[PDB]
Structure 1
Amino acid sequence: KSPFSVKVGLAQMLRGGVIMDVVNAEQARIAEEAGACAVMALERVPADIRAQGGVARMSDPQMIKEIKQAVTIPVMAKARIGHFVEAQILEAIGIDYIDESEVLTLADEDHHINKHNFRIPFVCGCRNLGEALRRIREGAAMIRTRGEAGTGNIIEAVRHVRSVNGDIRVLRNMDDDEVFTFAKKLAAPYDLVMQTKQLGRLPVVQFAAGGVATPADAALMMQLGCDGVFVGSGIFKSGDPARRARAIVQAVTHYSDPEMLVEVSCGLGEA
């Protein structure tokens, strides 16, 4: 079994879960108590990063350690795209996942982190199938839609989810002789394209992220065929986080049960 396939298997254990952005140990315990499958440690949530500006970097290791010691579920953390030394530091803290994240300030305009040089799994974002496969070829063990972080607006995540899944479906019936050109037009490595055609799905876990604000948003992503969701700003920037976090966890667990979605949405407060 390859070290990459082992990393792919680790991320498969989050299948069906919700990953919540947290900024302190208290928020972390709330997220775990509600049933988050993992927490994303950061010092400014995406809606704050947008509203404030300035350079957004890797979080201080000290605060990430506090979150790591406050929960038993997996802890992720963001590194800037291309900042392989920030990833080296996060890996040395002993967290479980690195998100090479477009919500932080781009560090390398032309290249991402070479993720195969690391032991621990990476998440990367994408807007289309070609981007996803390029990130995977670089070593991402898990893929999320980029969406539009910090807006509470689901429209871009829906577009990205549909783009990726729609091109996957196209790929399944496609004449094999046409797959070479299709790989060229996606600027994607052909072997990952054929692997995707063999599986009928993305070769790694695919979560939705960016703008998921409500239980209905979360279940919509799942019915569009994601394996889980990230929620960052939509929980703690609301008036009632500890109850809304549970509602979104419930909505991902029972995403095809409208009676359940009604119950968890009722009197949930201002989003």
Structure 2
Amino acid sequence: DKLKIIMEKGTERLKRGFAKMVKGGVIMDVTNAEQARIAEEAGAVAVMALHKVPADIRKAGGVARMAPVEKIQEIMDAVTIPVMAKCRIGHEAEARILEALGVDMIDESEVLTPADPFFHIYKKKFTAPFVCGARNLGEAVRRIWEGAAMIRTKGEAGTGNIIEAVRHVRLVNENIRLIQRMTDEEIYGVAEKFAEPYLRLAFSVKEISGLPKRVLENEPIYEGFTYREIVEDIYKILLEIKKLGRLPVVNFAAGGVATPADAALMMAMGMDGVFVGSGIFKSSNPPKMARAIVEAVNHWDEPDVLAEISREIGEPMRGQA
């Protein structure tokens, strides 16, 4: 047909466009409307609604799910900047609920307890735009194909340690520079590999059925798509990245960003922005810490200014090695 192409396109651009306006900023994690207020007052271009911090209980033996709906409502009310909420990997009901509730963006989040061990949410079917984590280029591209409108690093949550975030950024960038040194048929090789994870359910079922674990040409693997059809779509996304030299979506740093210096570092690595959660609340005057983070991002190239922002800002959390 001639539509559904200029329609699906227009719908994709719309979503990606939303994410654009949070560029150059800091998205802060808040647990109560009190916090949501400090955050807006500090310069957060957005907030991330939480009840308990997913990083401990579950990670003191629990299951971390969607935040309670009323607790989210309360946060959307208290502030005028956009508000986000997390859902569990693959949990379509949670996501829809978060979307009927009218959140601005949904985080399909590895920090919550995953709910489908095979498949992420097919985000292209939603109206709310999604942000998703990636540890490397393959992850970023899979999430994007699925419909992700924004990408952040997975990093290392709850630890306040920047290392993992840096690894992910580098893994993604080096994989882009590699794609650019590549021929079109080489790039299609990468697309095949990047599409292997979608096979996981088909292969398990083959083994349960006593058949050999190999790809079959016409067999739907995910949401009606054949393996080849996924490769092809990923390929196109890979050429688009070859041309742009970065992800075709807004791309943030997340996980372990604990100080103005940490924040400046990701910007220096070419990130569009920064998520921070634990880092801030804690310390003896966090409103200043929150503000520091905000300022480090605006002035990430000016050392003399970062040194000023840093002067007396509180006490950054005890992390985890």
Provide the TM-score with structure 1 as the length reference. 0.97
Report what 2:274 is aligned to: 229
Q: Match for 2:123: what amino acid? A: K
CA distance in 1, matches of 2:33, 2:39: 10
Do the aligned partners of 2:134 and 2:153 also contact (CA within 8 Å) in 1? yes
CA separation in 2, counterparts of 1:270 and 1:59? 28
For the residue of structure 2 that corresponds to 1:125, the secondary structure is: strand
The percent of aligned pairs where both chains have the same amino acid is 67
- Gaps (5+ residues) in structure 2? 1-8, 196-230, 317-321
Deviations for 1:16-42, whole angstroms, at most 9, x for unmatched residues?
000000011110010000000000001
Q: What is the match of residue 186 of structure 2?
A: 178
Q: Is the partner of 1:76 in helix, strand or coil? A: strand
Equivalent in 212, 221, 224 of residue 257 of structure 2: 212
Aligned residue type for 2:171: S
**Partner Cα separation in structure 2 for residue 47 and residue 219 of structure 1:** 24
Distance 1:84 1:200 in 2: 32
Query: Any idea what SS the aligned residue of 1:123 has?
Result: strand
Alignment of 1:104-143 (within 5 A): 104-143=112-151
Matching of residue 241 in structure 1 with residue 286 in structure 2: yes
Match runs of 1:160-199 below 5 Å? 160-187=168-195, 189-199=234-244
Q: Is 1:146 aligned to 2:191, yes or no? A: no
- Contact kept in structure 2, 1:50 and 1:150, CA below 8 Å: no
Cα deviation for residue 185 of structure 1 reads 3.1
Q: State the alpha-carbon separation in 2 of the partners of residues 257 and 240 from structure 1.
A: 24
Deviations 1:86-120 (A, max 9, x none): 00100011110000001100101100011011101
Unpaired segments ≥5 residues, structure 1: none
Separation (CA, whole Å) in 2 of partners of 1:253 and 1:194: 31
- Residues 157 and 256, structure 2, Cα contact 8 Å, conserved in 1: yes
In the alignment, the residues of structure 1 paired with residue 14 and residue 115 of structure 2 have an alpha-carbon distance, to the nearest angstrom, of 28
Q: Distance in 1 between matches of 2:91 and 2:275?
A: 22
The residue number in structure 2 matching 1:72 is 80
Aligned residues between the structures = 271
Q: Tell me if the contact between 1:115 and 1:138 (Cα under 8 Å) persists in the aligned partners.
A: yes
What is the TM-score of this pair, normalised by structure 2?
A: 0.82
Q: After superposition, what is the alpha-carbon deviation per residue over 1:102-156, rounded to whole angstroms, capped at 9, x for unaligned?
A: 1100101100011011101000000000100000100100000000001000010
* CA distance in structure 2 between the partners assigned to 1:86 and 1:57 by the alignment: 9
- Give SS of 1:235's match: coil
Q: Which has the larger radius of gyration?
A: 2
Instruction: Decide which of 306, 310, 319 is 1:265's aligned counterpart.
Output: 310
